[PDB]
Design a protein around this ligand. Structure first.
Ligand SMILES: CN1CCC(c2ccc(Nc3cc(-c4ccnc(-n5ncc6cc(C(C)(C)C)cc(F)c6c5=O)c4CO)nn(C)c3=O)nc2)CC1
Length: 264
């Protein structure tokens, strides 16, 4: 599973993530890769090293494939699939694209296909948002950095009160009881569907992070986005039932998105 660090070639800076510097490279001088350079004291290295075994066995076309690790060095490196068009949230905000609703529906299907794969593997993402989704050269949308939230050492991210915590993508049982489940990832999907049809708009945009958690409890749910059909909104709304047991599964939601495009 270990990748040779000298087998990698740094070519361009892909930005900053939770674990620092991310770069574009090439493995063996032919195959494209993304290199996450883990910043000192940002990750639970020990726990991540052991769990990378299970993460590598997860192979779905709409999931950002972890090719391997460089663990016999400081900083340690994570080699993943390269997505040319970058972050889905940034891609949704670029007005130039001038997306059809059929394209936004296709984006949802790409995230849902990946999530049903993760559900069938009893694997939680734990931070499903557009910011953690990527876009390749073919415009194919893929689920990224799934489960890596467990190894984040950063205090502002781990705490439900913190400035980095995914408050807006979180259901009431998470914000209140720290009750993470399949249904907490299910709530996040409805928020991601909203981000897509809202074209990268921030959920609960008018509100502050503190004011978001208060309204979410009172039963305030996201409105119907301008680009969303009545049938498409019924799908994102079904993810936000107060009783987690009443929310559907990624399997059902997948069937839901596919019936909607056959009737688009
Ligand atoms: C003008 N152009 C210039 C190039 C630009 C561009 C930007 C980019 C591009 N590709 C990629 C860019 C990246 C990439 C770059 C920077 N930061 C992150 N990032 N973000 C969030 C994140 C969250 C977590 C938790 C635990 C869940 C909280 C953990 C993480 F480790 C991260 C993390 O690393 C990523 C995603 O891997 N990756 N991968 C595969 C890419 O393929 N490709 C092109 C697009 C605009």
């Amino acid at each position: 599973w270990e990748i040779d660090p000298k087998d990698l070639t740094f070519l361009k800076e892909l930005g900053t993530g939770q674990f620092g510097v991310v770069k574009y490279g090439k493995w063996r001088g032919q195959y494209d890769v993304a290199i996450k350079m883990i910043k000192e004291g940002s990750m639970s290295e020990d726990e991540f090293i052991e769990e990378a075994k299970v993460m590598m066995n997860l192979s779905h076309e709409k999931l950002v494939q972890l090719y391997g690790v460089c663990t016999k060095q400081r900083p340690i490196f994570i080699i993943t699939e390269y997505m040319a068009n970058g972050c889905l949230l940034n891609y949704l905000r670029e007005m130039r694209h001038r997306f059809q609703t059929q394209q936004l529906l296709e984006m949802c299907k790409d995230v849902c296909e990946a999530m049903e794969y993760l559900e069938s593997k009893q694997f939680l993402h734990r931070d499903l948002a557009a910011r953690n989704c990527l876009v390749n050269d073919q415009g194919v949308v893929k689920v990224s950095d799934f489960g890596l939230s467990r190894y984040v050492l950063d205090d502002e991210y781990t705490s439900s009160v913190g400035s980095k915590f995914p408050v807006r993508w979180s259901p009431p049982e998470v914000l209140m009881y720290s009750k993470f489940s399949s249904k907490s990832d299910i709530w996040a999907f409805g928020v991601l569907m909203w981000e897509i049809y809202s074209l990268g708009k921030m959920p609960y945009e008018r509100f502050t992070n503190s004011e978001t958690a208060e309204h979410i409890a009172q039963g305030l749910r996201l409105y119907r986005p301008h680009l969303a059909s009545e049938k498409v909104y019924t799908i994102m709304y079904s993810c936000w039932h107060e009783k987690a047991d009443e929310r559907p599964t990624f399997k059902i939601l997948l069937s839901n998105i596919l019936d909607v495009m056959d009737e688009e």
